Tab-separated table of C-alpha atoms and ligand atoms in Angstrom:
chain	number	residue	atom	x	y	z
A	1	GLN	CA	94.981	100.932	104.703
A	2	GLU	CA	94.112	97.428	105.889
A	3	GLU	CA	90.860	95.820	104.738
A	4	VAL	CA	89.917	92.130	104.509
A	5	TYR	CA	88.753	90.824	101.132
A	6	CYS	CA	89.326	87.278	99.812
A	7	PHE	CA	88.011	84.309	101.815
A	8	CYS	CA	91.538	84.390	103.192
A	9	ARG	CA	89.870	86.555	105.849
A	10	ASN	CA	93.053	88.627	105.869
A	11	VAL	CA	93.874	92.089	104.578
A	12	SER	CA	94.727	93.056	101.008
A	13	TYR	CA	98.460	92.379	100.801
A	14	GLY	CA	98.942	94.200	97.492
A	15	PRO	CA	98.473	91.961	94.403
A	16	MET	CA	94.693	91.792	93.931
A	17	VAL	CA	91.727	91.830	91.562
A	18	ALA	CA	87.925	92.221	91.678
A	19	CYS	CA	85.312	89.512	91.024
A	20	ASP	CA	84.217	90.078	87.419
A	21	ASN	CA	81.248	87.770	87.979
A	22	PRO	CA	77.539	88.836	88.071
A	23	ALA	CA	77.572	87.356	91.590
A	24	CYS	CA	80.966	86.786	93.278
A	25	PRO	CA	80.375	87.137	97.089
A	26	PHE	CA	82.844	90.059	97.012
A	27	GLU	CA	84.530	92.320	94.447
A	28	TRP	CA	88.132	92.307	95.680
A	29	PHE	CA	90.493	89.337	96.087
A	30	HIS	CA	94.233	88.942	96.610
A	31	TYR	CA	96.591	86.970	94.392
A	32	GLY	CA	98.088	85.398	97.507
A	33	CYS	CA	94.494	84.570	98.383
A	34	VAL	CA	93.740	83.082	94.974
A	35	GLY	CA	96.081	82.018	92.164
A	36	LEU	CA	97.447	84.398	89.490
A	37	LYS	CA	99.870	87.215	88.636
A	38	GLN	CA	98.827	90.704	87.522
A	39	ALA	CA	95.695	88.863	86.350
A	40	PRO	CA	95.680	87.365	82.801
A	41	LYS	CA	95.762	89.799	79.872
A	42	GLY	CA	92.053	90.645	80.040
A	43	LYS	CA	90.075	89.745	83.159
A	44	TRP	CA	90.358	87.457	86.178
A	45	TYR	CA	87.717	85.930	88.428
A	46	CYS	CA	87.673	86.740	92.124
A	47	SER	CA	88.084	83.005	92.783
A	48	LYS	CA	88.176	79.579	91.149
A	49	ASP	CA	84.431	79.745	91.754
A	50	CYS	CA	83.864	83.445	90.992
A	51	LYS	CA	84.597	82.297	87.404
A	52	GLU	CA	82.589	79.069	87.422
A	53	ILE	CA	79.804	81.131	88.992
A	54	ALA	CA	79.824	83.353	85.903
A	55	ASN	CA	79.614	80.307	83.641
A	56	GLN	CA	76.466	79.313	85.551
A	57	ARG	CA	76.107	75.523	85.852
A	58	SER	CA	78.602	74.142	83.331
A	59	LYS	CA	80.289	70.765	82.838
A	60	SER	CA	83.583	72.668	82.704
B	1	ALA	CA	88.411	92.942	85.756
B	2	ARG	CA	89.048	95.917	88.056
B	3	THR	CA	92.386	95.106	89.691
B	4	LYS	CA	94.694	96.536	92.324
B	5	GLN	CA	98.166	95.000	92.501
B	6	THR	CA	101.481	95.559	94.282
B	7	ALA	CA	103.612	92.545	93.307
B	8	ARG	CA	104.154	89.510	95.558
B	9	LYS	CA	106.779	88.808	98.229
C	101	ZN	ZN1	84.143	86.344	93.040
C	102	ZN	ZN1	92.856	86.702	100.562
């Protein structure tokens, strides 16, 4: 099945993850869309922001 | 996080 997800505006290639952030515009993003592999041993954030969004206003 | 993967080309 072909469904768009990450801001990439393209379909889910295969390697993906879901935004583990209270917000995260979506809840499915591709690795080719973002940056990672099999997602770190634990949890990944839909996007470089999806994570920062979970931190909620942080100097980091 | 809920993930769905299939390796990368
Ligand atoms: Zn997100
Ligand atoms: Zn994408």
